[PDB]
Amino acid sequence: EDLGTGLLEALLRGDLAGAEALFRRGLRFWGPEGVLEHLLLPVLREVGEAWHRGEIGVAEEHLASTFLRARLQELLDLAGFPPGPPVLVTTPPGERHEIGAMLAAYHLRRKGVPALYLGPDTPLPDLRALARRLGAGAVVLSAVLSEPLRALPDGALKDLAPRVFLGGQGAGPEEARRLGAEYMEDLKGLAEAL
Amino acid sequence: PEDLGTGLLEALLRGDLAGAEALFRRGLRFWGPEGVLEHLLLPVLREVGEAWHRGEIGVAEEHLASTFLRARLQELLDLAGFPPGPPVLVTTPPGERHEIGAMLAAYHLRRKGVPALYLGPDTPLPDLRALARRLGAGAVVLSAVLSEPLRALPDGALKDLAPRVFLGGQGAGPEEARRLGAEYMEDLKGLAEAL
Amino acid sequence: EDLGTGLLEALLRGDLAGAEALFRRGLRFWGPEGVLEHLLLPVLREVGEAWHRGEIGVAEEHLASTFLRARLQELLDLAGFPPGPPVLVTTPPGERHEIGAMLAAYHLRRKGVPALYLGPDTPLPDLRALARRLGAGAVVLSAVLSEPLRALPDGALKDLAPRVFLGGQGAGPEEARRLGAEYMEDLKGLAEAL
Amino acid sequence: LGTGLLEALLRGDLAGAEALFRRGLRFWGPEGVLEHLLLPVLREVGEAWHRGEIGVAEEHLASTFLRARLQELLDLAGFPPGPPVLVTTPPGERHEIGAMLAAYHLRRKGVPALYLGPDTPLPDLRALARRLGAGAVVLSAVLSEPLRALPDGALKDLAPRVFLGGQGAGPEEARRLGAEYMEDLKGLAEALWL
Ligand code: B12
Ligand code: B12
Numbered sequence: 001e002d003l004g005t006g007l008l009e010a011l012l013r014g015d016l017a018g019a020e021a022l023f024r025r026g027l028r029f030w031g032p033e034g035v036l037e038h039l040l041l042p043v044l045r046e047v048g049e050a051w052h053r054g055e056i057g058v059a060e061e062h063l064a065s066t067f068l069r070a071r072l073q074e075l076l077d078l079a080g081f082p083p084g085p086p087v088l089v090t091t092p093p094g095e096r097h098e099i100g101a102m103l104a105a106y107h108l109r110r111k112g113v114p115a116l117y118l119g120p121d122t123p124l125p126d127l128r129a130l131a132r133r134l135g136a137g138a139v140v141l142s143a144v145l146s147e148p149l150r151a152l153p154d155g156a157l158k159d160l161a162p163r164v165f166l167g168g169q170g171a172g173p174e175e176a177r178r179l180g181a182e183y184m185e186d187l188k189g190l191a192e193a194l
Numbered sequence: 195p196e197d198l199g200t201g202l203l204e205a206l207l208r209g210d211l212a213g214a215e216a217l218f219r220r221g222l223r224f225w226g227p228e229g230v231l232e233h234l235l236l237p238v239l240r241e242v243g244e245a246w247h248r249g250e251i252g253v254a255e256e257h258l259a260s261t262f263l264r265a266r267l268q269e270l271l272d273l274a275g276f277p278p279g280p281p282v283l284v285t286t287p288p289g290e291r292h293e294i295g296a297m298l299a300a301y302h303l304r305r306k307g308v309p310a311l312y313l314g315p316d317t318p319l320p321d322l323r324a325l326a327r328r329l330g331a332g333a334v335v336l337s338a339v340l341s342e343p344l345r346a347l348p349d350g351a352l353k354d355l356a357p358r359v360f361l362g363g364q365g366a367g368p369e370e371a372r373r374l375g376a377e378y379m380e381d382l383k384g385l386a387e388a389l
Numbered sequence: 390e391d392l393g394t395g396l397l398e399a400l401l402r403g404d405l406a407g408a409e410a411l412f413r414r415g416l417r418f419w420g421p422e423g424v425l426e427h428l429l430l431p432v433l434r435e436v437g438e439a440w441h442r443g444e445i446g447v448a449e450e451h452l453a454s455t456f457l458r459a460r461l462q463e464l465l466d467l468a469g470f471p472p473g474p475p476v477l478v479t480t481p482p483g484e485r486h487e488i489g490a491m492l493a494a495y496h497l498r499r500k501g502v503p504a505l506y507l508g509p510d511t512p513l514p515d516l517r518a519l520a521r522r523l524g525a526g527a528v529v530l531s532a533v534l535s536e537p538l539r540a541l542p543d544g545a546l547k548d549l550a551p552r553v554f555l556g557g558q559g560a561g562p563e564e565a566r567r568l569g570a571e572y573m574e575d576l577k578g579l580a581e582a583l
Numbered sequence: 584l585g586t587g588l589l590e591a592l593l594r595g596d597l598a599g600a601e602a603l604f605r606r607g608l609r610f611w612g613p614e615g616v617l618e619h620l621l622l623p624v625l626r627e628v629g630e631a632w633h634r635g636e637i638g639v640a641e642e643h644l645a646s647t648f649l650r651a652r653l654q655e656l657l658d659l660a661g662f663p664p665g666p667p668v669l670v671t672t673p674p675g676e677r678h679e680i681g682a683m684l685a686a687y688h689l690r691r692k693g694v695p696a697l698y699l700g701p702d703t704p705l706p707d708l709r710a711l712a713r714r715l716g717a718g719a720v721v722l723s724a725v726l727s728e729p730l731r732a733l734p735d736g737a738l739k740d741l742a743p744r745v746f747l748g749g750q751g752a753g754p755e756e757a758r759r760l761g762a763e764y765m766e767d768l769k770g771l772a773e774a775l776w777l
């Protein structure tokens with residue numbers, strides 16, 4: 001697992017070419033899904049750990065996250081966008097971590113589901129209005145922090161779309177039930193739940 | 195055509211991303227890389243903002259269009275060269291979450307062979323200064339869309355970020371740049387010529 | 390390696406739309422340089438071998454090569470073209486295979502070198518005259534065939550520019566030395582050599 | 584705009600040339616920029632070389648640039664499905680922009696013109712047209728000598744219909760070779776439907 005360390009080290013020195021080359025190598029080794037699990041995700045977690053310990057600053061994290069977000073968006077577009085009633089994917093209001101939402105939309109598209117990624121931080125009434133107008137079959141929410149969920153009143157997610165899914169590190173079964181959403185433990189079960 | 199701007203937004207609003215991606219590529223091929231940004235990307239984003247402010251569209255619709263257009267620009271950014279040598283750090287002031295202006299600056303720089311490192315938006319100044327120092331960055335470029343994040347900064351706050359510091363955007367002006375200790379830049383074209 | 394098989398089949402059946410889609414697919418997966426290495430080049434090589442074996446005709450090679458040349462030029466125009474003294478890229482007189490020179494120009498542009506791609510088959514006096522007038526720092530020559538080089542006298546490439554580089558299948562260290570040019574093995578070390 | 588574009592290319596200013604061509608496209612449109620900008624420049628470049636005012640390397644640079652631009656327009660015109668029309672040049676003819684221009688005008692009228700590139704051997708051209716079930720073959724002749732080198736009826740059986748045009752071609756010569764002569768690119772698609 002040299003690639004994880006090397007990719008991080010390449011990004012931290014502002015070597016985009018080297019970072020890109022290391023990521024492509026991961027894609028070659030593990031394929032699209034594999035490179036997320038073994039490279040993109042571990043690096044994102046380590047970046048958070050390094051910042052938390054004071055080993056790197058915010059600007060370093062920004063650089064790494066922006067790079068990896070660009071790579072995931074590539075895979076997202078590579079997965080394609082099929083016809084039919086879309087599934088809207090975003091994060092609850094106040095939640096600015098968006099890569100979990102992108103990841104969810106990615107796994108849905110891989111299964112032929114037209115997951116529309118909106119970006120993060122969408123007000124619930126606006127989310128519901130879009131879902132209604134596009135005739136969206138479902139809404140998917142990624143919660144990394146728990147406070148944006150705790151800030152919501154009971155039943156807040158209930159009427160967003162015919163089906164409403166909630167997951168992420170910030171989400172739990174008890175909280176999803178309170179908000180009126182279906183809890184999904186992992187991305188594996190999310191794709192099959194539809 | 196003047197239809198492409200209308201066409202792209204209409205496709206996005208109906209959730210036709212495939213059609214939207216196709217219309218953008220037509221713009222890219224007709225207007226060129228810089229052209230499609232000026233004549234397609236920017237006018238659509240401006241209209242999206244005006245339509246929301248008038249109450250014609252909701253926030254979720256803006257999110258959809260902006261996320262799409264950001265993805266297109268990032269695609270163009272990665273296709274441009276990225277030369278070796280001391281980098282130029284591009285970001286936005288703390289409190290500024292509009293990031294496409296900074297992305298544009300980074301892109302115009304890369305297109306002229308300047309190693310612009312796009313960081314993403316909203317970077318605390320001490321962290322920005324520390325990264326520039328460690329990488330021996332030649333310059334820092336800031337895009338300010340809102341004026342309030344700049345006003346919240348004390349005098350000379352941007353002075354010691356890098357050997358050269360630039361400030362532009364709708365939220366920026368020559369007077370405010372002088373107060374923060376940065377060089378004001380009106381347009382993206384002259385930015386590359388200044389380096 | 391399946392994309393290559395798929396891409397060639399689409400071209401051989403005259404399906405340009407599918408071919409363009411497949412190439413963009415490979416571009417998003419392998420990246421800009423990667424798609425040239427893992428898709429464009431292996432397809433071009435296989436096209437050459439198939440024709441030589443008598444499996445495909447000239448018109449079929451023509452179609453695929455014209456297509457792939459168009460894709461590479463598309464990538465070339467999207468790369469940065471920095472200011473400053475240019476680097477002239479072409480092929481020796483008598484050499485009409487031009488994609489190697491285009492590749493060279495592309496790798497240079499991606500590294501922030503103002504590589505001016507001239508097209509193939511350029512007379513040496515005219516090439517020298519242009520290099521002189523534009524104050525070019527270097528001349529880069531791609532030789533696919535060996536015969537065009539062998540037909541040139543000793544030191545024929547010596548005075549083209551302050552630096553002259555020569556690479557490609559038709560080129561070798563011994564032949565580069567005789568012509569008075571610097572031999573370059575890899576496109577990656579071409580930018581560094583400047 | 585023509586003079587400036589030519590001057591920009593002659594000094595190796597791709598950015599300036601690119602910007603000037605884009606202005607021509609915005610002002611005159613797709614067809615207009617061909618007639619008012621691309622074609623006049625290509626002709627003047629040839630005149631300039633003939634007079635000794637510019638060298639071959641200069642011409643190459645300008646020609647390669649404009650070929651890239653035309654190819655962009657070619658792809659912008661799209662490629663509709665159906666029985667393809669194969670477009671190339673006679674054996675020995677290396678000027679390819681006339682053929683590209685022909686393929687462009689066909690596509691703008693909804694005709695699936697497959698551009699092969701220049702210089703296709705007639706038996707190979709005939710074999711591909713047969714296998715793809717091509718409705719027609721279109722040939723661009725800039726020089727007359729490649730036509731004069733062909734025997735009577737040489738072009739007759741390439742496809743159900745065979746069109747010949749360009750500076751090197753005339754009505755009598757087309758008739759001799761068994762091809763239909765076309766003066767202007769405009770009435771090419773109308774003739775194919777007739
Ligand atoms: C990048 C980053 C940011 C960037 C985000 C950029 C962007 N555009 O996305 C920015 C700079 C905005 C940021 C800000 C902040 N962040 Co932050 N950030 C991170 C970092 C490094 C990675 C985030 C990421 O993309 N992770 C990738 C996701 C996909 O990984 P994952 O959560 O493990 O997700 C898995 C599963 O949950 C599943 N999943 C995800 N979504 C969904 C959805 C469904 C439906 C399902 C089924 C599954 C699922 O997918 C993954 C499978 O392995 C994390 C570190 C970390 N450990 O995650 C910190 C982290 C999340 N952030 C943290 C903090 C503290 C903050 C700030 C408060 C900092 C500050 N003081 O300003 C702010 C809060 C902003 C806000 N209001 O949301 C802390 C959270 C601590 C806590 N629990 O309170 C972390 C954990 C860092 C740390 N180690 O301390 N952050
Ligand atoms: C998308 C968007 C968002 C997205 C951003 C997504 C993202 N990740 O980037 C989100 C949802 C986050 C958002 C939030 C908000 N936004 Co908003 N948003 C927009 C929108 C529709 C387009 C943004 C964009 O990219 N525009 C394109 C920009 C780059 O073009 P431009 O500024 O004219 O740039 C040109 C030059 O300035 C130059 N330039 C830019 N940067 C630089 C840098 C240098 C160095 C140089 C030389 C030149 C230069 O480049 C361009 C060349 O033509 C605009 C509408 C608009 N008209 O801009 C509103 C807009 C900017 N937002 C607005 C508002 C009100 C907000 C919010 C306060 C809304 C709210 N109530 O929450 C928040 C504020 C968040 C924050 N703290 O930053 C208002 C701003 C009004 C004001 N000036 O006070 C606008 C104008 C909409 C409106 N009301 O009409 N926004």
Ligand code: B12
Pocket residue numbers: 430433434435436437438441450454483484485486487488489490492493529530531532533534535554555556557558573574575576579
């Ligand atoms: C397309 C093609 C043509 C087209 C060219 C169209 C165009 N405008 O470019 C046309 C139809 C004109 C053509 C004609 C001919 N060709 Co031809 N053609 C090919 C084909 C299929 C691909 C050419 C190509 O672009 N390849 C891609 C090259 C760039 O890949 P590569 O060599 O592996 O390059 C790598 C490195 O060398 C490096 N490199 C390249 N340049 C440089 C430069 C520098 C500085 C550096 C550092 C590195 C470097 O880049 C790559 C990195 O992986 C090849 C097959 C092949 N294997 O190449 C045959 C091939 C080259 N052609 C061949 C032949 C026989 C001919 C003709 C004689 C056929 C004929 N009887 O008319 C003529 C000769 C024309 C001439 N005078 O040059 C033979 C050559 C055999 C030989 N060496 O003797 C080949 C090998 C086919 C075969 N038999 O398998 N050809």
Ligand code: B12
Pocket residue numbers: 622625626628629630633642646675676677678679680681682684685721722723724725726727746747748749750765766767768771
């Ligand atoms: C660029 C160029 C080249 C490039 C080609 C690059 C490429 N890949 O295409 C290269 C370097 C290969 C080249 C080589 C040569 N060329 Co040269 N070249 C030119 C130049 C400057 C432009 C060619 C071009 O594309 N013109 C654009 C075309 C589209 O314009 P047009 O012919 O007026 O076309 C119009 C109509 O005819 C119509 N048309 C065209 N095709 C068709 C097809 C159909 C079906 C229809 C209906 C209509 C139609 O379309 C246009 C509508 O307005 C011309 C100058 C000129 N006046 O054309 C010289 C020119 C054609 N070349 C010339 C010469 C001398 C040569 C060489 C012999 C030079 C040499 N000694 O090596 C070689 C021959 C190579 C060969 N075997 O073909 C001379 C021809 C003189 C003559 N004897 O007739 C010219 C005229 C220059 C000059 N003034 O002396 N050439």
Ligand SMILES: C[C@H]1O[C@@H](n2cnc3c(N)ncnc32)[C@H](O)[C@@H]1O
Pocket residue numbers: 047048051052057058059061062316317318
């Ligand atoms: C979770 C991530 O949040 C980022 N982070 C921490 N504080 C701030 C701030 N004031 N502004 C922007 N990003 C911040 C760090 O880079 C960390 O990695």
Ligand SMILES: C[C@H]1O[C@@H](n2cnc3c(N)ncnc32)[C@H](O)[C@@H]1O
Pocket residue numbers: 121122123242243246247252253254256257
């Ligand atoms: C400038 C853009 O900000 C978006 N916007 C406005 N209010 C909010 C909010 N509460 N949360 C997120 N985005 C918002 C709108 O969609 C507008 O177009």
Ligand SMILES: C[C@H]1O[C@@H](n2cnc3c(N)ncnc32)[C@H](O)[C@@H]1O
Pocket residue numbers: 436437440441446447448450451702703704
């Ligand atoms: C190297 C490439 O040269 C092409 N080729 C072979 N003979 C000729 C010819 N007479 N004219 C044009 N192209 C030719 C073949 O298509 C082969 O793939």
Ligand SMILES: C[C@H]1O[C@@H](n2cnc3c(N)ncnc32)[C@H](O)[C@@H]1O
Pocket residue numbers: 482510511512628629632638639640642643
């Ligand atoms: C018609 C065009 O042919 C080009 N031309 C003339 N002689 C040669 C040669 N030996 N090799 C390649 N191109 C040549 C010139 O650039 C002229 O403009």
